[PDB]
Amino acid sequence: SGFRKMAFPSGKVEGCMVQVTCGTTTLNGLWLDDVVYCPRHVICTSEDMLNPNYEDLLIRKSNHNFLVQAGNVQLRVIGHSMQNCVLKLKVDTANPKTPKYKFVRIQPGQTFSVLACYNGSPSGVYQCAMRPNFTIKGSFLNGSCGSVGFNIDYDCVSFCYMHHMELPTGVHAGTDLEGNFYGPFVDRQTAQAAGTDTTITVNVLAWLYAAVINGDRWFLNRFTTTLNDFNLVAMKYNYEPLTQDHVDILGPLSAQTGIAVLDMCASLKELLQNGMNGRTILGSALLEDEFTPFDVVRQCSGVT
């Protein structure tokens, strides 16, 4: 028993972290096979971060200008190319610590682990979610660019995120591993609209099922609702509309607890309309939406 914001073990990713320097800028790189991936703004100075012409800036750079250090050893750069907002630096040595990996583009509402890094060295690991507005609420400082988000299926690391930018709001923006930004963001020093964020309803419901599994049952009531009635409530409280695809994914959690999905939606409705009343659920005084139904099953069953 017990329920925690659990991140994946970071070892397979720690072995891929390198430091990338170019000009006077240093950030993190991801060394998989003979390629180092890093945010393309490594080639920029503060003056051109206002409106950078990356193609033109990259033209003034040669392989020898990209200094890639793996721990305390220098990697030799034999090729460079820009794919969207990332640079791929071909190195002459394949990373001996490359795990089985995939590059995936996660959906909004999905969760992943982040290994925050500075100068190619890991400082910490935390679990977070891709918000519906395609931002992440991470913990990142200057130098953290190139830090990656990932998931692990048995031995395979699915890299889903690379950190690029901090918004003026303090929220974070970044790309998938092909350099495509999640959301409308562009790698420019210009104020950019994050957009209205919503609460991931299916995730809150999964966390309510985790709460029942771990003894917290005060919020369960004698009521039920329909998808249409519940969605009127979700709309009012800026919660994502619940669909039958959401209910289907909540099936395993419903079967384990014997609480029908719509019965749990009625508990959520009452919690939204009435609040917690000074009570807690799994040590939280607010409704948590950063655990997917898969996360809850995984944590509650001990999948390694």
Add this chain to the structure above:
Amino acid sequence: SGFRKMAFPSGKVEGCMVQVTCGTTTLNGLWLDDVVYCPRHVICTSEDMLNPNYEDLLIRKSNHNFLVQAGNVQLRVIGHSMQNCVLKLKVDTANPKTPKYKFVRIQPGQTFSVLACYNGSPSGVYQCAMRPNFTIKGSFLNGSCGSVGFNIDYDCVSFCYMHHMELPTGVHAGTDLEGNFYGPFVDRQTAQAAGTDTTITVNVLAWLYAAVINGDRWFLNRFTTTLNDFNLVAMKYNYEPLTQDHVDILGPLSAQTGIAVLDMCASLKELLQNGMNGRTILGSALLEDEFTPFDVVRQCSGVT
């Protein structure tokens, strides 16, 4: 900017995790040098977990009865001994992945990372604190015994905790790496009093300083207090008494924000007496006490 319950990167510890089987029981071991450390209840069956005589039970066991598997390779056991509530199994091979390590006994209120493990394989990592009542609120299932808690100083892993037991309350109990239980707990299947827990005042105050650093300032007021006045309030709300040693550790955070420690205690007093009023601080609707002043400085400065 941003503030997260950040755990240490788990790689150096993942390389030390092994599976220990004895009789019909399997749990996790910690392989450092030529020694495997694991909870001594690995030698027990369900019948003798009611009142085990570990010395007598261990007598019926030989080196060949302890099956230690590191990944998919079998380690040869050449010695066994009991030190308090842990067994130390001498193996014929030193772990090639042993990091620089120390065995430390943490103080209540101190935090550490846990690498939850099942069958010698890591499933996840989370940050937690040794509660003032010497329990931890972890996330552990059957088979998680032997999972360890640790801290990292540059390259040195300070192992502070080994998981042993789940209390009937769902809270967790365990030992330091010499087998000494934190708290009054004994490795027996008997109901055991956890004791009254308190809120780690110095940690809440550190988290309030992290909140100011990351823009959250609504809770700051035009008041100040004294250690004696504040401690009357802390007593009423089951908060640990604040001492000058606590204030001294809060010095770096006070200097960075220009908010005197007693001024921040007045904000805490008002928050305890008035509540959050439906507001949040760093995405939390309750006062967080699982970040030490050291944790806040580390996260807010990017120490790798």
